[PDB]
Design a binder for this molecule. Structure first.
Ligand SMILES: O=C(Cc1cccc(Oc2ccccc2)c1)Nc1nnc(N[C@@H]2CCN(c3cccnn3)C2)s1
Ligand SMILES: O=C(Cc1cccc(Oc2ccccc2)c1)Nc1nnc(N[C@@H]2CCN(c3cccnn3)C2)s1
Lengths: 403, 392, 393, 401
C-alpha cells in the first residue's frame, strides 16, 4: 500500500521531494490541516528536523498511519476525482454571480444593516473532505434561519421522528397561508418556519437551564463543522430580543393552543430561540456542517458520526420543500437541492452524496433570499447534473463532476 | 472475442439452449425483450444444443447487452434476490384488505417492476387492464414539456402544491392552476397539447407517445369509463367554465372540446406490466429501457418527477414525500405509478382506496419498500442504517 | 267630506285649485286610488270650471278617506314640497360626481325617483329611461321565493350572511350553501326555488306578474339584447351552475342549465326609475303597494329581504354602506341603486358609470348625502338627531 | 293649570287624594319612586307627612309636573306598561325552562355561578322599569363592555379617528381566527383584537388608574348612577390566563396597529380591567336605554354620548355583537345586542328601551341559552325587529299603541 503509492508519486527517481508530495496532496482538494491527516503531517514535520527528500522507508514511516485515506486520494477515488477542474467551474460561477449586485441588505436590526453589500463568499466541502473557497469565506455571520434545519436534526437525533412530529408538521403551508402560525391540526406547519422552529427549540434538552441547552447545541454544531469556527453574536442576540414582537406573538399563541411539551417556560424558550439565531459561522465552517448532512450524518473531515440517518433524511426532506421561504416551491422545482436561507444572506446548501456548500452575500431579494446565492444555485444546477431528479446516466449537456 | 468470452462463462464443450435461456432469465431480462429480438430470431431459426460457432452466430448482434447482463453490470445485479423481497412485500400488503372501491373485485392486487436496464418482475394481477385516470397526468405533462418547453407550459400552470387548506380552490394567486397534478392544472395541460388539430388526432398522438413510453406493451381505451366520466364530471365542467372566464386557456381554445379530450385521456387503459415500463422510462432519463429509444427530453422527465414528488398523492402528497420520498402518482381505479430514479419503475394496482383516494395496499407496499431499501430520495448511498441496498 | 270642502274653500272652489292643492301633497292625479274622483271630475266638466258644496261631494266621496289624509297633512312626509326641494339639491350635488366607468348607455344619464309609503311621488333627471335591473332583481325574487315557500324552506338552500371580504370569490359557505341571496350563486339557487315543476315561460310570466303588482302596474319590460349578451358571456355563472350541481345545492329534479337561462332572463328585466321607486316603496310599506293598496308580499318576505339588503346589498361596499348609510339598498351593473327607507319611502337612483366596486358613483354620493341631511339611518334616533332634518314632522 | 288638571284626574271627583293612591297610580306608569327626575316631588312628600289637598299636592308636584303629566296622560313610549310587563313575565318563565348550556369554567370566578340564575331587566327611553328574576346580582360585563368603550372612544375622538385603527365589519365566519383584515386593522370593535385597539385610544397619556376612573365615571352616567363595580378576582384570573390576548397584543404591536407611544402591556392590563367591571341587570338595562335614547340617560335626562357614538355603536352591535351567531341574530332578531361570557346580553330596542338579560349557561357559540331564547320570543311577539314595518306587521303585538 505504502509502497504502491510510492511508485505512483515517484515514477522514476528513488526519492520523492517533500513539496512534490504536498502539492499532489493539495491538488486532490484535501487540506494539509485535515484532522484525518495529522499523524502523517506530524511525521513529516519531524522528518524535516531530523535530517527535503524521502526514500521508500522514510515515506513508509510518514504515511502508514493515514494510508487508507491517501490511497483513495491518489487513486482518484474521491467523489469528485478531477477536483481542480471542478473548482475552476465554481470560480467561474462565483464570478458570474458577482455581477448581480441588486437586492437589499437586511436592516431591521443594526447588526445586519452594517454588513457591506459586496461581501460574497462560497465554500465547498465534499463528503470526502475536499475543500474549496472563493471570496469572503472567513468572515463571520449569524446563521439566522440557517440554524433551523440544524436544531431540527438535533431534535430528531435525540428524540426520534415520531415524538418531534407530535409537535411540528411536515409540509409547506402553501403561499396564501405563509402567515398562519398553525395548520388545521393545530401544529406549526413545519420546522423551517418561525413557529415550527420555536416549538422545535422547546423540545431540545428539556429540564435544564438555557446555558446548558445552549452549550449542548454548541457542542453539537462543533462536531458538525469538524471543530471549525462556531461563535456567538451577543449584539445580534440583544437586538433580536428587543424587537421580536412577532415571535412573542407566536409564543403566546402556541402557549394558548397547547403546542409545547408540558412544563415549558415559553418566555425562556423564546430567549433560547433568539440565542440560536445569533450563532455565528463562516462560509468555511458552515460548508462542513452542510457536508455532514450530505454525508449521512458523518462529518467528512473527522469521520465522526454526529447525527442519525433518520435525523439527516428528515432534515434534507424538509429543506427541499420548506427551505427558501415563499420561493421554496420554485427552488425545489428549478434547483431541486435541500437548501436553507437566512436573513444575514447565507444559503446552506446540500448536494446529497456529493458535497455541502455555504453561499453568503447579505443583499436579499423581495422573498428574503440572497440574490447572489440564488443566482449561483441556479447556475450550479444548470452546469452539473445535481438536481434531485436529474438522471445519472442520461443528463443531456450537463457535466457530471463524479466521472 | 466478446462472444467467445461469454461462451466460456456459460459453459463443457456444448451449451444446451434451455440452459442459456434460464441463465438469461435469471438476470431478469425477458426473452421477448425487443433489444434481444435478433438473438431470439436466430435461435428460433436453428431449432437443442449449441457449439461455440453457432452460439456466436445467434448472440453476436445483441452481444453488448448480453455481456452486461451476465456481467451483473445491471443496476440490480442480484435480481433473483431482489424479486424475493418484492414478493414478501406484495404478500404483506395483500393482507391490507381495508378501504373502499370507487363507484372490479376488491381482491385484485398486482405489482410490476421494470428496472432502467429492462429487468422485469410481476406478482399478482398484473395483466388485467384498468384506467390510468389521474396516473395519466404526469404522462401528459411530460408530453407537453417535451413538445413546448418548461417556460411555455408554466405560463398556464403552477409548480407547487396548494397546501391542505387549499385543496378546493382552482387557481393560485397568479390566476393559474396550482400544478399539473390536480384536475384544474391537468385540464389546462390538456389544452396545450397538439394545438390546432382536432381531438381524434390529438388522442392518436398521445396514444402513439404512450406506446413508446411503454415500449409497445398494452395501451388501450375504455369507452365505458369515458361515457361515465363525461356524464358525471360536473366538477370538471365547473373547472372548465372557471378557467375560461379567468382566461387560463391558450388563445383559440374550444373549452368543451378540451373536456372531452380530458375525459378521454383519463379513460386510457394499461396493465401493471405496461405501466411499469412507462414508469421505468421516467426513471431512465426519458429513454425507454426495453427498446433503447428516447421518448422524452431530460427536461420533461426532471419536471415531471419533481411535480410527482410534491403533488402526486392528493392530500397525502406531503406525508408521502416525507416518509417515502419517491415520485409517485395515484389514480381512482387503484393505480400507483411509482418511479425510483436511476433504478426502476413500478405500477401497483389494487382498487380499494383509503379516505384520501389512494390505493390502500399500494400505499402499504410503498412504505414497506422504502423501509426495506435505501430508495428514499434523501437516503445516503454510503451510510444508511439497517436498510438493504439492492444496487451493491 | 263637507269638512274638506271648507278647508279648500267662498262657497265655490275652482277645479284647477283643487287639483293644484292635490298635487302639492305629492299625490299624482293618475293615482289608481283616486280614479273614481278623477273620473267624476272629468264627467262633471262635460256635464257643464267651478264646484258647489254638493257637486264636490259627488266627486270625492268614493275616495274621501285618502283625500282627508292628504289634506290634513297626515301623510308620512307632511311637507312634501320642502322635501322635494331637498331631493332636487342632492340630485344636483351628485350630478357633479362625473367619475366611474360605464359597464361593458350615456354616462350623462342620472335620475332619482321617490315613492313614499303613502303614494307621494317625485322625479328628477332621467327617470323615464328604461334600464335592466341586473342584480337589483335579486331581492325581488328572494322576496317572491320567501312569500311562496317560507323562510325555513328557502334558507335550507341559501345562507343569510355576507361572506366577508376575503370569502368574496368562494361560491359556498362552510355549510355548502351560497352565502346569501344577494350574490350570484345564492341568486342562482333562489331562482331554482321559484315555481318548481313548470317551464321557463310560465316561471317568467309568474315573476313578471309579481313585479307588475310591486310596481303598481308601471313599466316592467324585458331586454332581449341584454339577455343574449348575458348568456353568450356568462362563463362564471355556468361555472357556478356546475359547481352547485356537483355539491347538490339545487332542489331534487332541477334542470340546472334551464335555471341559468331563467336566471339570465330575470337579470334582463327592465324598469324605469319611476316604476322601480314604487317597487322599493312596496318593500318600505310592509309588502303593500302604496299606489294601489294591494298586498303583494308577506311581511316575513319583506323583513327577510330588507335584512339581507342591509348587510349584503352593495357588493364589497356592503359593510361600509351598512355603517355609513344604514339603509337596505341593492345595486346593479346598469347603474341602478334600489333603496328603501322603511316606514317612509322607496327610491331608485340610476347613473351608468360605476366605481371600482361596481356601484354607481352618483347613486353612492346621493345615498351618503341623503343620510347626512335626514335622520333615516337605521340607528338614527327619532327624538335626538343632532344637526339632521326629520321630514316626518 | 297643569298641577290642578292632574289633581282632578287622580282625585276622581273627591276633594282629597291619599298618598298611597298617588304612589300606586305613579308606579303603574312604570316609573319608580326613586327616579332621579322625581327627587323634588318625593322629597316634598317626605317633608309634609297621608291625605293631600289640591294645594298640598300642587306644592309637592310642581317641579316634576312636566314629567308626571306625560306619565298620567299615557304619553310614554309604552303607554300600557302594566300589560307589557306581564308579556315580559311570560317570556321570562318560558326561557326559564331552557336550562341547557355550559357555565363558563375556564377561570374560578365564572365557574362558580349557579346555572339557574336568570334575570331580565327593562328600561324604556322614558325611564319605565321592569325586572324579573335575579336582577340585583352583580356580574362582570366581559365582552358586553366592548360597545361601551367603543362609544366612549367615538364620543371623545370621533368616527374618523377611531376607524383609522379599527374596521367597521364582521370578518365572515371563517375568519374568526384572523386578528387583522386586509388593511392590517382589527375587523371591528366587537372582537378582542378590535377592543384592545379601542382600549388603547381612550384617554391617552395618563396612567391606567386615571383611565380606569374616567371610564368608570362614564359608565356611572350611562347607568344613571346605578350599580357599577369591579371584580379584582376576575381581573387577576383574566391577566393570568389571557395568553390569546397577549398573542393579539404582540401581533398588533408588530403590525403597528396601536397609536404612537403606546405601552402595549399596560393596555392589556387596562383591557382586562375593563372586562372585569361589574353591573347588575338593573343598572345595565339603563346603560342599554341610554343607547336606545340617542345618548341621553333616560332616568337622569343627562346627555352622556354624542349621536355619532350611539349610531356607530348600534350599527356594529347589529352586525358583530353575538360572536359567530352575529349574522343569524341580525337576520332573525334584528336588534343591536352584545353578549358576554358571564352570561349577559346587552340589548337595545332603538327608540323604545334597553334590556339586560343574564343567565350564566352559554351555548356552543358562547351566548346565553336563556337570553338567546328570550330575545327570539321577544321579537316573535312584538314588532321590534329593525325591519319590521310599523303599519303592516301581521299578528304581531306593537306595545307603543
Ligand atoms: O370550501 C368552501 C368554504 C370553506 C369551508 C371551510 C374552510 C374554508 O376556508 C378557506 C378559506 C379560503 C380559501 C379556501 C378555504 C372555506 N367553499 C368554497 N366555495 N367556492 C369554492 N371554490 C370555487 C371555485 C374555485 N374558486 C376559486 C376562487 C379563488 C381562487 N381559486 N378558485 C371558487 S370552495
Ligand atoms: O392577512 C390577514 C388577512 C387576510 C388577507 C388576505 C387574504 C387572507 O386569506 C386567508 C384565507 C384563509 C385563511 C387565512 C387567510 C387573509 N390577516 C391576519 N390576521 N391574523 C393572522 N394571523 C393570526 C396569528 C396566527 N393566526 C392563525 C389562525 C389560524 C391558524 N393559524 N394561525 C391568526 S394573518
Amino acid at each position: 500500500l505504502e509502497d504502491l503509492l510510492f511508485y505512483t508519486i515517484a515514477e522514476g527517481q528513488e526519492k520523492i521531494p517533500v513539496h512534490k508530495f504536498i502539492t499532489a496532496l493539495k491538488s486532490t482538494g484535501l487540506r494539509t490541516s485535515d484532522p484525518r491527516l495529522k499523524e502523517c503531517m506530524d511525521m513529516l514535520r519531524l522528518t524535516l528536523q531530523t535530517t527535503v527528500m524521502l526514500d521508500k522507508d522514510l515515506f513508509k514511516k510518514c504515511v502508514q498511519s493515514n494510508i487508507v485515506l491517501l490511497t483513495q486520494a491518489f487513486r482518484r477515488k474521491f467523489v469528485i476525482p478531477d477536483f481542480m477542474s471542478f473548482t475552476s467551474h465554481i470560480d467561474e460561477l462565483y464570478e458570474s454571480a458577482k455581477k448581480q449586485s441588486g437586492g437589499k441588505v437586511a436592516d431591521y436590526i443594526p447588526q445586519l444593516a452594517k454588513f457591506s453589500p459586496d461581501l460574497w463568499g462560497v465554500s465547498v466541502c465534499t463528503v470526502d473532505g475536499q475543500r474549496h473557497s472563493t471570496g469572503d469565506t472567513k468572515v463571520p455571520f449569524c446563521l439566522q434561519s440557517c440554524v433551523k434545519p440544524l436544531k431540527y436534526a438535533i431534535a430528531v437525533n435525540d428524540l426520534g421522528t415520531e415524538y418531534v412530529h407530535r409537535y411540528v408538521g411536515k409540509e409547506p403551508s402553501g403561499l396564501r397561508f405563509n402567515k398562519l402560525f398553525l395548520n388545521e391540526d393545530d401544529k406549526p406547519h413545519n420546522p423551517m418556519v418561525n413557529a415550527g422552529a420555536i416549538v422545535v427549540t422547546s423540545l431540545i434538552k428539556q429540564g435544564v437551564n438555557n446555558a446548558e441547552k445552549f452549550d449542548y447545541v454548541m457542542q453539537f454544531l462543533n462536531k458538525m463543522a469538524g471543530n471549525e469556527y462556531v461563535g456567538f453574536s451577543n449584539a445580534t442576540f440583544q437586538s433580536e430580543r428587543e424587537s421580536g414582537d412577532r415571535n412573542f406573538a407566536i409564543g403566546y399563541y402556541l402557549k394558548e393552543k397547547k403546542c409545547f411539551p408540558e412544563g415549558t417556560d415559553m418566555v425562556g424558550i423564546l430567549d433560547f430561540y433568539f440565542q440560536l439565531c445569533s450563532i455565528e459561522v463562516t462560509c468555511e465552517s458552515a460548508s462542513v456542517m452542510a457536508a455532514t448532512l450530505a454525508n449521512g450524518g458523518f462529518c467528512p473531515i473527522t469521520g465522526e458520526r454526529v447525527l442519525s440517518p433518520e435525523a439527516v433524511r428528515n432534515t434534507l426532506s424538509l429543506m427541499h420543500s420548506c427551505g427558501m421561504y415563499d420561493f421554496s416551491g420554485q427552488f425545489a422545482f428549478h434547483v431541486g437541492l435541500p437548501a436553507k436561507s437566512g436573513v444575514a444572506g447565507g444559503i446552506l446548501l446540500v448536494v446529497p452524496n456529493v458535497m455541502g456548500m455555504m453561499c453568503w452575500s447579505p443583499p436579499l431579494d423581495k422573498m428574503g433570499n440572497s440574490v447572489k446565492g440564488i443566482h449561483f444555485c441556479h447556475d450550479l444546477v444548470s452546469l452539473c447534473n445535481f438536481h434531485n431528479y436529474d438522471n445519472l446516466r442520461h443528463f443531456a449537456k450537463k457535466l457530471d463532476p463524479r466521472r
